[PDB]
Protein backbone atom coordinates (compact mmCIF):
# COMPACT_ATOMS: atom_id res chain seq x y z
CA UNK A 1 0.00 0.00 0.00
CA UNK A 2 2.95 2.30 -1.00
CA UNK A 3 2.22 4.94 -3.74
CA UNK A 4 5.14 4.83 -6.27
CA UNK A 5 5.53 8.36 -7.77
CA UNK A 6 5.76 8.16 -11.59
CA UNK A 7 9.09 9.73 -12.70
CA UNK A 8 7.51 10.56 -16.18
CA UNK A 9 4.66 12.40 -14.32
CA UNK A 10 2.05 10.83 -16.72
CA UNK A 11 -1.00 11.50 -14.48
CA UNK A 12 -0.11 14.16 -11.86
CA UNK A 13 -3.88 14.64 -11.21
CA UNK A 14 -4.52 10.94 -10.26
CA UNK A 15 -1.31 10.68 -8.09
CA UNK A 16 -2.29 13.89 -6.18
CA UNK A 17 -5.83 12.42 -5.63
CA UNK A 18 -4.27 9.13 -4.39
CA UNK A 19 -1.89 11.02 -2.00
CA UNK A 20 -4.73 13.04 -0.42
CA UNK A 21 -6.79 9.78 0.08
CA UNK A 22 -3.78 7.96 1.69
CA UNK A 23 -3.04 10.99 4.01
CA UNK A 24 -2.35 12.84 6.16
CA UNK A 25 0.84 10.66 6.15
CA UNK A 26 1.12 8.49 3.00
CA UNK A 27 3.69 5.70 2.39
CA UNK A 28 5.38 6.51 -0.95
CA UNK A 29 8.18 5.12 -3.17
CA UNK A 30 10.42 7.69 -4.91
CA UNK A 31 11.75 6.72 -8.37
CA UNK A 32 14.49 4.03 -8.03
CA UNK A 33 12.56 2.20 -5.24
CA UNK A 34 13.33 4.48 -2.21
CA UNK A 35 10.60 4.40 0.47
CA UNK A 36 9.64 7.65 2.31
CA UNK A 37 6.55 9.27 3.90
CA UNK A 38 4.65 12.13 2.19
CA UNK A 39 2.54 14.59 4.24
CA UNK A 40 -0.44 15.12 1.86
CA UNK A 41 -2.88 17.21 4.00
CA UNK A 42 -2.62 20.97 4.81
CA UNK A 43 -3.01 21.04 8.63
CA UNK A 44 -0.53 18.16 9.22
CA UNK A 45 2.02 19.65 6.75
CA UNK A 46 2.03 22.97 8.71
CA UNK A 47 2.60 21.07 12.03
CA UNK A 48 5.47 19.00 10.55
CA UNK A 49 7.05 22.09 8.85
CA UNK A 50 7.27 23.84 12.29
CA UNK A 51 8.28 20.60 14.14
CA UNK A 52 12.00 20.81 15.15
CA UNK A 53 12.16 16.93 15.14
CA UNK A 54 11.93 17.01 11.27
CA UNK A 55 15.39 18.15 10.05
CA UNK A 56 17.33 18.45 6.74
CA UNK A 57 20.44 16.67 8.27
CA UNK A 58 20.94 13.57 6.04
CA UNK A 59 22.90 11.85 8.96
CA UNK A 60 19.38 11.28 10.47
CA UNK A 61 18.20 9.25 7.44
CA UNK A 62 18.62 5.62 8.64
CA UNK A 63 18.50 4.15 5.07
CA UNK A 64 21.32 6.60 4.04
CA UNK A 65 23.57 5.85 7.10
CA UNK A 66 23.14 2.02 6.47
CA UNK A 67 24.48 2.39 2.84
CA UNK A 68 21.02 1.40 1.36
CA UNK A 69 20.79 4.44 -1.07
CA UNK A 70 22.49 3.72 -4.45
CA UNK A 71 25.25 6.36 -5.00
CA UNK A 72 23.83 6.94 -8.58
CA UNK A 73 20.19 7.22 -7.33
CA UNK A 74 18.89 9.91 -9.75
CA UNK A 75 17.51 12.03 -6.79
CA UNK A 76 20.72 11.89 -4.66
CA UNK A 77 21.49 15.48 -5.85
CA UNK A 78 18.17 16.73 -4.35
CA UNK A 79 18.41 14.58 -1.17
CA UNK A 80 22.14 15.28 -0.48
CA UNK A 81 23.07 18.78 -1.82
CA UNK A 82 26.05 20.97 -0.73
CA UNK A 83 25.66 23.16 2.46
CA UNK A 84 23.22 26.13 2.07
CA UNK A 85 20.29 27.72 3.95
CA UNK A 86 18.46 24.67 2.40
CA UNK A 87 20.30 21.97 4.44
CA UNK A 88 20.46 23.50 7.98
CA UNK A 89 17.95 23.89 10.87
CA UNK A 90 17.82 25.61 14.25
CA UNK A 91 20.23 28.41 15.23
CA UNK A 92 22.51 27.97 12.10
CA UNK A 93 19.40 28.29 9.87
CA UNK A 94 17.94 31.29 11.79
CA UNK A 95 21.30 33.12 11.35
CA UNK A 96 21.19 32.62 7.52
CA UNK A 97 17.47 33.60 7.22
CA UNK A 98 18.02 36.76 9.33
CA UNK A 99 20.96 37.85 7.10
CA UNK A 100 19.20 36.91 3.80
CA UNK A 101 16.02 38.79 4.93
CA UNK A 102 18.08 42.04 5.29
CA UNK A 103 19.08 41.69 1.56
CA UNK A 104 15.95 40.18 -0.22
CA UNK A 105 13.51 42.70 1.35
CA UNK A 106 9.91 43.34 0.23
CA UNK A 107 11.13 46.83 -0.88
CA UNK A 108 14.12 45.45 -2.93
CA UNK A 109 11.60 43.17 -4.70
CA UNK A 110 8.98 45.93 -5.26
CA UNK A 111 11.76 48.18 -6.72
CA UNK A 112 12.25 45.54 -9.52
CA UNK A 113 8.64 46.23 -10.83
CA UNK A 114 9.73 48.74 -13.59
CA UNK A 115 12.71 46.58 -14.79
CA UNK A 116 10.46 43.42 -14.89
CA UNK A 117 7.84 45.51 -16.86
CA UNK A 118 10.57 46.60 -19.39
CA UNK A 119 12.02 43.02 -19.71
CA UNK A 120 8.45 41.67 -20.24
CA UNK A 121 7.74 44.37 -22.93
CA UNK A 122 10.95 43.41 -24.89
CA UNK A 123 10.08 39.64 -24.77
CA UNK A 124 6.49 40.38 -25.98
CA UNK A 125 7.95 42.62 -28.82
CA UNK A 126 9.88 39.56 -30.16
CA UNK A 127 6.84 37.25 -30.39
CA UNK A 128 6.15 36.52 -34.11
CA UNK A 129 3.88 34.03 -35.89
CA UNK A 130 0.25 33.11 -35.17
CA UNK A 131 1.08 30.20 -32.84
CA UNK A 132 4.12 30.19 -30.50
CA UNK A 133 5.65 28.16 -27.68
CA UNK A 134 4.81 30.71 -24.93
CA UNK A 135 7.17 28.82 -22.52
CA UNK A 136 10.31 28.88 -24.74
CA UNK A 137 9.49 32.35 -26.24
CA UNK A 138 8.22 34.29 -23.18
CA UNK A 139 7.93 32.54 -19.75
CA UNK A 140 11.38 30.76 -19.90
CA UNK A 141 13.76 33.72 -20.42
CA UNK A 142 11.93 36.30 -18.16
CA UNK A 143 13.05 35.02 -14.68
CA UNK A 144 16.67 34.55 -15.87
CA UNK A 145 16.85 38.20 -17.01
CA UNK A 146 15.11 39.28 -13.77
CA UNK A 147 17.32 37.30 -11.31
CA UNK A 148 20.54 38.36 -13.17
CA UNK A 149 19.48 42.04 -12.79
CA UNK A 150 18.32 41.50 -9.16
CA UNK A 151 21.70 39.91 -8.32
CA UNK A 152 23.69 42.54 -10.25
CA UNK A 153 25.24 39.93 -12.57
CA UNK A 154 27.18 41.42 -15.53
CA UNK A 155 24.75 41.85 -18.44
CA UNK A 156 27.53 40.51 -20.73
CA UNK A 157 27.15 37.04 -19.10
CA UNK A 158 23.44 36.58 -20.06
CA UNK A 159 24.19 34.50 -23.22
CA UNK A 160 26.26 32.03 -21.10
CA UNK A 161 23.66 32.02 -18.24
CA UNK A 162 21.01 30.86 -20.75
CA UNK A 163 23.32 27.94 -21.75
CA UNK A 164 24.05 27.07 -18.05
CA UNK A 165 20.30 27.27 -17.10
CA UNK A 166 19.33 25.03 -20.04
CA UNK A 167 21.93 22.35 -19.00
CA UNK A 168 21.21 22.67 -15.25
CA UNK A 169 17.42 22.12 -15.65
CA UNK A 170 17.44 19.72 -18.70
CA UNK A 171 16.07 16.20 -17.94
CA UNK A 172 18.81 14.90 -20.41
CA UNK A 173 21.90 16.32 -18.57
CA UNK A 174 23.88 13.45 -16.90
CA UNK A 175 24.69 14.01 -13.17
CA UNK A 176 28.47 14.66 -13.81
CA UNK A 177 27.53 17.55 -16.16
CA UNK A 178 24.81 18.96 -13.78
CA UNK A 179 27.65 19.20 -11.17
CA UNK A 180 30.04 20.91 -13.70
CA UNK A 181 27.23 23.34 -14.73
CA UNK A 182 26.52 24.18 -11.04
CA UNK A 183 30.34 24.68 -10.52
CA UNK A 184 30.51 27.22 -13.42
CA UNK A 185 27.33 28.96 -12.10
CA UNK A 186 28.92 29.22 -8.58
CA UNK A 187 32.05 30.63 -10.34
CA UNK A 188 29.86 33.37 -11.92
CA UNK A 189 28.36 34.07 -8.44
CA UNK A 190 31.90 34.28 -6.84
CA UNK A 191 33.06 36.72 -9.59
CA UNK A 192 29.85 38.77 -9.00
CA UNK A 193 30.54 38.86 -5.21
CA UNK A 194 34.25 39.86 -5.71
CA UNK A 195 33.16 42.73 -8.08
CA UNK A 196 30.45 44.03 -5.68
CA UNK A 197 32.91 44.07 -2.72
CA UNK A 198 35.10 46.50 -4.83
CA UNK A 199 32.07 48.44 -6.24
CA UNK A 200 28.97 48.11 -4.00
CA UNK A 201 25.65 48.79 -5.89
CA UNK A 202 21.83 48.66 -5.42
CA UNK A 203 21.60 44.86 -5.98
CA UNK A 204 21.02 41.68 -3.95
CA UNK A 205 24.71 40.60 -4.06
CA UNK A 206 25.85 43.96 -2.56
CA UNK A 207 23.05 43.63 0.11
CA UNK A 208 24.11 40.03 1.03
CA UNK A 209 27.74 41.29 1.41
CA UNK A 210 26.49 44.18 3.66
CA UNK A 211 24.00 42.17 5.81
CA UNK A 212 24.98 41.87 9.47
CA UNK A 213 23.51 40.96 12.89
CA UNK A 214 25.69 42.19 15.87
CA UNK A 215 28.96 41.99 13.83
CA UNK A 216 28.04 38.56 12.27
CA UNK A 217 27.78 38.43 8.42
CA UNK A 218 27.74 35.77 5.62
CA UNK A 219 31.08 34.25 4.48
CA UNK A 220 31.96 34.29 0.75
CA UNK A 221 30.90 30.57 0.55
CA UNK A 222 27.46 31.36 2.16
CA UNK A 223 26.87 34.28 -0.27
CA UNK A 224 27.84 32.14 -3.29
CA UNK A 225 25.69 29.14 -2.10
CA UNK A 226 22.71 31.48 -1.39
CA UNK A 227 22.90 33.08 -4.89
CA UNK A 228 23.32 29.61 -6.55
CA UNK A 229 20.42 28.17 -4.47
CA UNK A 230 18.16 31.14 -5.41
CA UNK A 231 18.74 30.37 -9.15
CA UNK A 232 18.03 26.65 -8.66
CA UNK A 233 14.93 27.38 -6.53
CA UNK A 234 13.43 30.36 -8.49
CA UNK A 235 13.84 29.74 -12.27
CA UNK A 236 11.60 26.84 -13.43
CA UNK A 237 9.20 27.38 -10.47
CA UNK A 238 8.45 31.01 -11.60
CA UNK A 239 8.27 29.82 -15.28
CA UNK A 240 5.70 27.10 -14.28
CA UNK A 241 3.65 29.64 -12.23
CA UNK A 242 3.28 31.83 -15.41
CA UNK A 243 2.65 28.73 -17.64
CA UNK A 244 0.10 27.17 -15.25
CA UNK A 245 -1.73 30.56 -14.90
CA UNK A 246 -2.13 30.76 -18.76
CA UNK A 247 -3.28 27.05 -18.82
CA UNK A 248 -5.80 27.67 -15.96
CA UNK A 249 -7.28 30.84 -17.63
CA UNK A 250 -7.35 28.94 -20.99
CA UNK A 251 -9.33 25.98 -19.51
CA UNK A 252 -11.61 28.29 -17.40
CA UNK A 253 -12.80 30.86 -19.98
CA UNK A 254 -15.55 32.36 -17.71
CA UNK A 255 -12.84 33.24 -15.14
CA UNK A 256 -10.53 34.54 -17.90
CA UNK A 257 -13.47 36.84 -18.86
CA UNK A 258 -13.68 38.03 -15.19
CA UNK A 259 -9.97 39.05 -15.03
CA UNK A 260 -9.77 40.49 -18.64
CA UNK A 261 -12.96 42.56 -17.85
CA UNK A 262 -11.33 43.89 -14.59
CA UNK A 263 -13.94 42.16 -12.28
CA UNK A 264 -11.21 39.90 -10.78
CA UNK A 265 -7.62 41.11 -10.05
CA UNK A 266 -4.46 39.40 -11.42
CA UNK A 267 -3.32 38.64 -7.80
CA UNK A 268 -6.36 36.30 -7.41
CA UNK A 269 -5.24 34.41 -10.59
CA UNK A 270 -1.63 34.00 -9.26
CA UNK A 271 -2.66 32.94 -5.69
CA UNK A 272 -5.31 30.50 -7.00
CA UNK A 273 -2.76 29.08 -9.56
CA UNK A 274 -0.29 28.54 -6.61
CA UNK A 275 -2.91 26.58 -4.49
CA UNK A 276 -4.54 24.68 -7.39
CA UNK A 277 -1.41 23.96 -9.55
CA UNK A 278 1.84 24.74 -7.64
CA UNK A 279 5.02 24.51 -9.71
CA UNK A 280 6.44 22.38 -6.83
CA UNK A 281 4.56 19.08 -6.35
CA UNK A 282 6.98 17.61 -3.69
CA UNK A 283 9.88 18.96 -1.59
CA UNK A 284 12.76 16.65 -0.65
CA UNK A 285 13.60 16.09 2.13
CA UNK A 286 13.25 15.86 5.94
CA UNK A 287 14.20 13.18 8.54
CA UNK A 288 12.65 12.42 11.99
CA UNK A 289 15.14 12.67 14.95
CA UNK A 290 12.46 10.84 17.07
CA UNK A 291 9.02 9.18 16.56
CA UNK A 292 6.45 11.83 15.45
CA UNK A 293 2.70 11.15 15.71
CA UNK A 294 0.95 12.30 12.43
CA UNK A 295 -2.83 11.76 12.78
CA UNK A 296 -3.46 8.14 13.83
CA UNK A 297 0.02 7.19 12.43
CA UNK A 298 3.61 7.45 13.71
CA UNK A 299 6.50 8.76 11.59
CA UNK A 300 9.37 6.54 12.90
CA UNK A 301 12.71 8.10 14.04
CA UNK A 302 15.18 7.88 11.10
CA UNK A 303 12.49 7.75 8.39
CA UNK A 304 12.27 10.31 5.54
CA UNK A 305 9.49 12.86 4.85
CA UNK A 306 8.62 14.75 1.64
CA UNK A 307 6.01 17.54 1.64
CA UNK A 308 3.41 16.94 -1.11
CA UNK A 309 2.50 20.63 -1.78
CA UNK A 310 0.73 19.65 -5.04
CA UNK A 311 -1.63 17.19 -3.32
CA UNK A 312 -2.37 19.32 -0.23
CA UNK A 313 -3.18 22.46 -2.36
CA UNK A 314 -6.63 20.89 -3.08
CA UNK A 315 -7.25 19.84 0.59
CA UNK A 316 -11.05 20.02 1.16
CA UNK A 317 -10.36 20.29 4.94
CA UNK A 318 -8.42 23.59 4.31
CA UNK A 319 -10.40 25.15 1.38
CA UNK A 320 -13.94 23.60 1.60
CA UNK A 321 -15.87 21.47 -0.94
CA UNK A 322 -14.60 23.44 -4.06
CA UNK A 323 -10.86 22.74 -3.16
CA UNK A 324 -10.69 20.41 -6.22
CA UNK A 325 -11.58 23.22 -8.69
CA UNK A 326 -9.83 26.34 -10.07
CA UNK A 327 -11.88 29.35 -8.78
CA UNK A 328 -10.10 32.79 -8.73
CA UNK A 329 -13.15 34.16 -6.75
CA UNK A 330 -12.74 31.74 -3.76
CA UNK A 331 -12.33 32.92 -0.16
CA UNK A 332 -10.52 30.30 2.01
CA UNK A 333 -10.07 30.43 5.83
CA UNK A 334 -6.59 28.93 5.11
CA UNK A 335 -3.98 30.77 2.96
CA UNK A 336 -2.20 28.21 0.70
CA UNK A 337 1.30 27.05 1.77
CA UNK A 338 2.69 26.54 -1.76
CA UNK A 339 5.65 28.74 -0.61
CA UNK A 340 6.16 26.47 2.47
CA UNK A 341 5.62 27.28 6.16
CA UNK A 342 7.76 27.81 9.26
CA UNK A 343 11.50 28.49 9.19
CA UNK A 344 12.29 27.28 5.58
CA UNK A 345 9.39 29.35 4.03
CA UNK A 346 10.30 30.57 0.48
CA UNK A 347 12.34 33.80 0.65
CA UNK A 348 11.50 34.36 -3.08
CA UNK A 349 7.66 34.40 -2.68
CA UNK A 350 7.36 38.22 -3.29
CA UNK A 351 9.67 38.04 -6.34
CA UNK A 352 7.77 35.19 -8.09
CA UNK A 353 4.43 36.90 -7.23
CA UNK A 354 5.79 40.17 -8.79
CA UNK A 355 7.14 38.50 -11.99
CA UNK A 356 3.77 36.71 -12.59
CA UNK A 357 1.75 39.81 -11.49
CA UNK A 358 3.65 41.89 -14.14
CA UNK A 359 3.98 39.23 -16.91
CA UNK A 360 0.33 37.98 -17.09
CA UNK A 361 -1.53 41.33 -17.49
CA UNK A 362 1.25 42.47 -19.94
CA UNK A 363 0.83 39.26 -22.07
CA UNK A 364 -3.02 39.51 -22.28
CA UNK A 365 -2.79 43.35 -22.83
CA UNK A 366 -0.70 42.54 -25.98
CA UNK A 367 -2.77 39.39 -26.96
CA UNK A 368 -6.21 39.60 -25.24
CA UNK A 369 -7.55 36.70 -27.41
CA UNK A 370 -4.55 34.35 -26.72
CA UNK A 371 -5.50 30.71 -26.08
CA UNK A 372 -3.92 27.23 -26.28
CA UNK A 373 -3.10 26.14 -29.88
CA UNK A 374 -3.77 22.48 -28.73
CA UNK A 375 -6.37 20.88 -26.40
CA UNK A 376 -5.32 21.01 -22.68
CA UNK A 377 -5.17 17.14 -22.69
CA UNK A 378 -2.28 17.27 -25.24
CA UNK A 379 -0.08 19.30 -22.77
CA UNK A 380 2.78 17.06 -21.37
CA UNK A 381 4.53 17.15 -17.92
CA UNK A 382 8.35 16.99 -18.06
CA UNK A 383 9.77 13.85 -16.33
CA UNK A 384 10.72 15.77 -13.12
CA UNK A 385 8.92 14.01 -10.26
CA UNK A 386 9.14 16.96 -7.73
CA UNK A 387 8.06 19.69 -10.24
CA UNK A 388 4.86 20.51 -12.23
CA UNK A 389 6.65 21.64 -15.46
CA UNK A 390 5.34 21.38 -19.09
CA UNK A 391 7.50 20.56 -22.15
CA UNK A 392 5.83 23.52 -23.98
CA UNK A 393 2.83 25.89 -24.06
CA UNK A 394 1.64 26.12 -27.73
CA UNK A 395 -0.48 29.29 -27.82
CA UNK A 396 -2.58 30.99 -30.57
CA UNK A 397 -1.95 34.75 -29.92
CA UNK A 398 -5.11 35.83 -31.89
C1 LIG B 1 6.40 30.08 -7.86
C2 LIG B 1 7.70 30.10 -7.56
C3 LIG B 1 8.20 29.39 -6.36
C4 LIG B 1 7.66 28.41 -5.57
C5 LIG B 1 6.37 27.63 -5.79
C6 LIG B 1 8.57 28.19 -4.49
C7 LIG B 1 8.36 27.25 -3.44
C8 LIG B 1 9.24 27.03 -2.42
C9 LIG B 1 8.96 26.24 -1.29
C10 LIG B 1 7.67 25.45 -1.10
C11 LIG B 1 10.05 26.28 -0.47
C12 LIG B 1 10.15 25.56 0.85
C13 LIG B 1 10.39 24.09 0.73
C14 LIG B 1 10.20 23.43 2.12
O1 LIG B 1 10.83 23.84 3.11
O2 LIG B 1 9.38 22.48 2.26
C15 LIG B 1 11.00 27.15 -1.10
C16 LIG B 1 12.24 27.40 -0.62
C17 LIG B 1 13.12 28.30 -1.22
N1 LIG B 1 12.86 29.13 -2.27
FE1 LIG B 1 11.21 29.23 -3.28
N2 LIG B 1 9.60 29.01 -4.61
C18 LIG B 1 9.46 29.76 -5.72
C19 LIG B 1 10.27 30.76 -6.19
C20 LIG B 1 11.49 31.15 -5.68
C21 LIG B 1 12.27 32.26 -6.04
C22 LIG B 1 11.95 33.25 -7.17
C23 LIG B 1 13.42 32.20 -5.25
C24 LIG B 1 14.61 33.06 -5.07
C25 LIG B 1 14.72 34.27 -5.46
C26 LIG B 1 13.29 31.09 -4.39
C27 LIG B 1 14.23 30.74 -3.41
C28 LIG B 1 13.99 29.78 -2.45
C29 LIG B 1 15.03 29.38 -1.50
C30 LIG B 1 16.40 29.96 -1.42
C31 LIG B 1 14.48 28.45 -0.70
C32 LIG B 1 15.11 27.73 0.49
C33 LIG B 1 14.67 28.38 1.82
C34 LIG B 1 15.13 27.59 3.05
O3 LIG B 1 15.18 26.33 3.01
O4 LIG B 1 15.41 28.25 4.09
N3 LIG B 1 12.10 30.51 -4.63
N4 LIG B 1 10.48 27.64 -2.30
Amino acid sequence: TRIALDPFVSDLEAESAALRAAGPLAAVELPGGVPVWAVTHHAEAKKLLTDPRLVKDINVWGAWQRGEIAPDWPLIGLANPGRSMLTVDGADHRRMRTLVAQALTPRRVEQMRERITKLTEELLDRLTGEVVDLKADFAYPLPMYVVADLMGIDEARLPRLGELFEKFFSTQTPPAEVIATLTELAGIMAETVAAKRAAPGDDLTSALILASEDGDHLTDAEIVSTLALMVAAGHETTISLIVNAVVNLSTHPEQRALVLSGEADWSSVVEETLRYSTPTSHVLIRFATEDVPVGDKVLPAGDALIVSYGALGRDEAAHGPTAGEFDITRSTENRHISFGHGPHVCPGAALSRLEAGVALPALYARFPKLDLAVPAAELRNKPVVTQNDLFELPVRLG
Side-chain angles (χ1 to χ4, degrees):
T1 191
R2 205 177 273 287
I3 302 178
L5 306 185
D6 175 13
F8 300 109
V9 190
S10 307
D11 195 353
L12 175 59
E13 292 303 278
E15 215 159 88
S16 297
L19 286 156
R20 285 192 284 287
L25 191 77
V28 163
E29 177 170 303
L30 300 174
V34 173
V36 306
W37 303 88
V39 55
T40 69
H41 298 183
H42 182 99
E44 289 81 2
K46 291 183 79 173
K47 284 210 326 290
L48 286 166
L49 278 166
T50 52
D51 192 327
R53 303 173 287 183
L54 275 294
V55 297
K56 300 298 198 81
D57 186 347
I58 201 169
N59 295 313
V60 181
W61 190 10
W64 175 263
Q65 278 306 293
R66 292 199 292 275
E68 313 180 345
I69 308 304
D72 55 39
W73 182 46
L75 284 160
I76 194 170
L78 277 193
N80 186 36
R83 180 188 188 246
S84 67
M85 287 169 355
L86 190 69
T87 62
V88 294
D89 295 284
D92 290 350
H93 189 252
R94 282 188 300 275
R95 162 181 177 267
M96 294 195 84
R97 292 307 302 253
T98 297
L99 290 170
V100 168
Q102 285 179 23
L104 193 49
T105 60
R107 168 181 144 104
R108 180 174 300 289
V109 165
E110 180 58 30
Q111 285 172 163
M112 293 300 288
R113 176 175 299 275
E114 162 79 343
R115 280 167 284 167
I116 299 166
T117 305
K118 292 295 288 159
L119 288 170
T120 301
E121 165 177 30
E122 295 171 326
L123 291 162
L124 291 170
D125 290 351
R126 294 170 62 104
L127 288 196
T128 57
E130 293 195 79
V131 166
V132 297
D133 184 2
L134 202 58
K135 175 160 183 204
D137 291 339
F138 176 63
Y140 202 84
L142 177 57
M144 183 184 71
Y145 288 114
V146 172
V147 79
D149 189 285
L150 173 62
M151 290 172 170
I153 292 169
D154 282 341
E155 317 95 280
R157 291 186 187 278
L158 283 164
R160 182 51 172 168
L161 280 181
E163 294 181 337
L164 295 177
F165 283 37
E166 185 281 311
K167 280 169 214 299
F168 186 69
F169 289 111
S170 170
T171 56
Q172 294 307 80
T173 311
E177 196 184 338
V178 165
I179 287 151
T181 297
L182 194 43
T183 304
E184 188 173 340
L185 263 170
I188 291 169
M189 293 320 177
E191 289 189 12
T192 305
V193 172
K196 294 307 169 181
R197 283 185 192 280
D202 178 13
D203 65 79
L204 182 62
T205 299
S206 294
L208 284 166
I209 292 161
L210 192 66
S212 71
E213 175 90 328
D214 302 313
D216 186 24
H217 62 91
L218 301 167
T219 66
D220 255 8
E222 287 166 341
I223 301 171
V224 165
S225 71
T226 301
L227 294 168
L229 178 65
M230 290 180 166
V231 168
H235 187 60
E236 295 227 329
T237 54
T238 305
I239 295 158
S240 291
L241 169 54
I242 295 165
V243 164
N244 290 359
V246 173
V247 174
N248 294 338
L249 290 181
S250 293
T251 59
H252 299 73
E254 290 217 280
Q255 285 177 77
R256 190 168 81 240
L258 295 188
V259 67
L260 287 191
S261 89
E263 269 170 288
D265 70 17
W266 281 100
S267 178
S268 83
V269 177
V270 170
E271 296 312 307
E272 178 69 355
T273 296
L274 281 162
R275 182 198 70 77
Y276 179 84
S277 49
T278 172
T280 292
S281 299
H282 304 284
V283 168
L284 271 68
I285 186 158
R286 289 164 168 87
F287 311 107
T289 60
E290 33 198 290
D291 293 358
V292 175
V294 187
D296 60 284
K297 282 192 199 169
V298 164
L299 202 181
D303 268 9
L305 180 70
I306 69 181
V307 182
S308 293
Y309 289 102
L312 67 78
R314 311 189 194 174
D315 195 352
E316 300 204 23
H319 303 300
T322 68
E325 284 102 85
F326 187 79
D327 172 18
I328 66 165
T329 70
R330 85 199 312 118
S331 76
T332 181
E333 309 264 35
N334 299 306
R335 292 277 193 174
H336 70 71
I337 58 162
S338 288
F339 285 125
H341 181 72
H344 286 266
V345 70
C346 185
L351 176 63
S352 62
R353 282 174 165 133
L354 178 56
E355 297 186 42
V358 163
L360 294 162
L363 172 66
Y364 280 97
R366 201 78 69 100
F367 306 106
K369 297 183 175 80
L370 86 89
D371 203 342
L372 297 167
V374 301
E378 279 171 38
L379 296 169
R380 294 181 294 156
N381 276 101
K382 301 194 44 163
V384 183
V385 67
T386 57
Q387 308 311 128
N388 185 7
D389 303 344
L390 302 182
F391 277 105
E392 67 232 271
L393 183 50
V395 158
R396 191 164 298 283
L397 298 173

